[PDB]
């Protein structure tokens, strides 16, 4: 595998180079804007996934399942990362910066907003680095399947995370503690994604929001 053929620095460089861009909110209604934003983000995400070392090595069937399982998690960790410079606010887009109060007129979202804000705050207090961020996001993608190669690539990204921390001057003790905390936050992201998925499906059932074809298919996987 390519992932197993890279050094730690080569792995970081490949993940950083694979990064999707930050998109803007567009006109064509809060859910309408979010749906349009997420839909366009999904296209870049799929392209990003194909650029993650080890992902292409998977059969297309396996690739579909992982993305179907991870997509909302990946959207959320991206959102959480982008919001770190804005305490008490969610930066869905540079022209779409929302606080918890905006998530009231939709029901079930203000609770998700609070969790996203708290998660963003934790990453902020931990001084999360961009290099660490792209490792976690790749881990989320490869671990999404609650359902040996993937395990090998997961070990590779683990070593890469440890490498980054060692380079930063962190001691071995500080390394496994920081690693643990980051991975425990992934449990919170999984949780938020499950709740978000519930909210999206209920809104689809109530026919209050028009999700795109891709979002409909992705959501129908859950």
């Amino acid at each position: 595998s390519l992932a197993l053929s890279l050094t730690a620095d080569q792995m970081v460089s490949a993940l950083l180079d694979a990064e999707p861009p930050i998109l803007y909110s567009e006109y064509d209604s809060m859910m309408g804007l979010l749906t349009n934003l997420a839909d366009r983000e999904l296209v870049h995400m799929i392209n990003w996934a194909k650029r993650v070392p080890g992902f292409v090595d998977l059969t297309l069937h396996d690739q579909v399942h992982l993305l179907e399982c991870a997509w909302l998690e990946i959207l959320m960790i991206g959102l959480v990362w982008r919001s770190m410079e804005h305490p008490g606010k969610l930066l869905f887009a540079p022209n779409l910066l929302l606080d918890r109060n905006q998530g009231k007129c939709v029901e079930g979202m203000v609770e998700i907003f609070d969790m996203l804000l708290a998660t963003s705050s934790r990453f902020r207090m931990m001084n999360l680095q961009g290099e660490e961020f792209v490792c976690l996001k790749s881990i989320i993608l490869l671990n999404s399947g609650v359902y040996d190669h993937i395990h090998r690539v997961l070990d590779k990204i683990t070593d890469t995370l440890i490498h980054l921390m060692a380079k930063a001057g962190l001691t071995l003790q500080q390394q496994h503690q920081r690693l643990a905390q980051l991975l425990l936050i992934l449990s919170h992201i999984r949780h938020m994604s499950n709740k978000g998925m519930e909210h999206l499906y209920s809104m689809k059932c109530k026919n209050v929001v028009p999700l795109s074809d891709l979002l409909l298919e992705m959501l129908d996987a859950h």
Partner: peptide, 10 residues
């Protein structure tokens, strides 16, 4: 086909 399926092979 599925959109995700097609985008991954396109």
């Amino acid at each position: 086909h599925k959109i995700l399926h097609r985008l991954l092979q396109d």
